[PDB]
Amino acid sequence: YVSPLSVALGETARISCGRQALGSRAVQWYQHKPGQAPILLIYNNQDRPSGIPERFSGTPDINFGTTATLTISGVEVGDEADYYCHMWDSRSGFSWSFGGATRLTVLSQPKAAPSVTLFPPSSEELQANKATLVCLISDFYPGAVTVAWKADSSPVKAGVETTTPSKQSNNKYAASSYLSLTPEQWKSHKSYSCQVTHEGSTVEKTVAPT
């Protein structure tokens, strides 16, 4: 239900509505960020609610040949979201569906070095006959990442749960990795290390039982 739109940073993005109006149209443009509340960007073909920046503008229904287009001038990294085109007209009637959403992906964003934090298992966890190591990566761009675990020289292939880099608080990616072991396995090897590969670059954090 998503159409990719890879636009350049600092340029104008024109989102064409997937639905073609059959006559006199009333077009609404909604902005929806994941995990947030959808925002009403444009509520009439040329109307803009209060507080909405002037960089957003729609095509008014002057003539019939005008295709509904949401214009975003000077796009920033904070404009990456889903854009819904709620279409109304005389010959379609009540349009209950929000239509296909166009997901904006701003490009040319500067690279960010990943910040990796490694936490060993807890004592209250070791006494619970379990032991999970936490590898938290944060503040990196783009979302391409490769998390690996190494028990000293030996690698670890099973027992690894890694999340998707969905986190975009400051428009930077962040993910989590969990290595589940038993207390005997945790105290067995000398040290466990989380090796994160971002843009090919390898950063490694290491912990040990103490």
Partner: protein, 226 residues
């Protein structure tokens, strides 16, 4: 205005989902209200709306399984979805709908139509549909680098979301980072919430993390000590 959603978090299939929308900053009798949802992997699906005359209109795709009601005593909107299935798992938003009249000719000739646009929304409530039961989360401390150190709380083995993690209520805001939840092979979720605290602040300042899981009705305050 301000809108807040409340839900059960988990409903077994072949039952009745029910969510509530608390409104504030304006009267409830002089506005069109509406319910909208978004399922994982699906876009926004308009559920229905209710007018100021308490005459509701629903999406014909829900097969008339939805009922929207309004209560003026508590100024709350209510949505009930009967006979839920795995597909009904979605985040439910309540919004305020405005009706605009779009005229392209003679008003007497019916050459006009009405369109609806929602201006104010709510952050939404996450309601999952599953036959399993809610499990209380286990919270463990992660004791603590450029004059600072990482101090976190690890929430594990809970089902399902939402789950809120705070740090000393609103006293701790800088450095508070709550990473996204992981979905393990067992169907259980887990997340981590870390804070970057100056090294000198350790030993003298207390940092307690408050974890709340609404579906299982659990509230735990854990203090992390280095």
């Amino acid at each position: 205005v301000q809108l807040q959603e409340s839900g059960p978090g988990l409903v077994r299939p072949s039952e009745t989902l029910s969510v509530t929308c608390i409104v504030s900053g304006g009267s409830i009798s002089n506005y069109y209200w509406t319910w909208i949802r978004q399922s994982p992997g699906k876009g926004l699906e308009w559920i229905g709306y209710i007018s100021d005359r308490e005459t509701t209109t629903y999406n014909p795709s829900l097969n008339s399984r939805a009922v929207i009601s309004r209560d003026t005593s508590k100024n709350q909107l209510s949505l009930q979805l009967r006979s839920v299935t795995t597909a009904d798992t979605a985040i439910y938003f309540c919004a305020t709908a405005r009706r605009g009249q779009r005229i392209y000719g003679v008003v007497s000739f019916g050459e006009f139509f009405y369109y609806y646009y929602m201006d104010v929304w709510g952050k939404g409530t996450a309601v999952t549909v599953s036959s399993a039961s809610t499990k209380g989360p286990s919270v463990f401390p992660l004791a603590p680098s450029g004059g600072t150190a990482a101090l976190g709380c690890l929430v594990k083995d809970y089902f399902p979301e939402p789950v809120t993690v705070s740090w000393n209520s609103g006293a701790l805001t800088s450095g508070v980072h709550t990473f996204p939840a992981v979905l393990q092979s067992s169907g259980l979720y887990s997340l981590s919430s870390v804070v970057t605290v100056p090294s000198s602040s350790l030993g003298t300042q207390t940092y307690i993390c408050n974890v709340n899981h609404k579906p299982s009705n659990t509230k735990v305050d854990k203090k992390v000590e280095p």
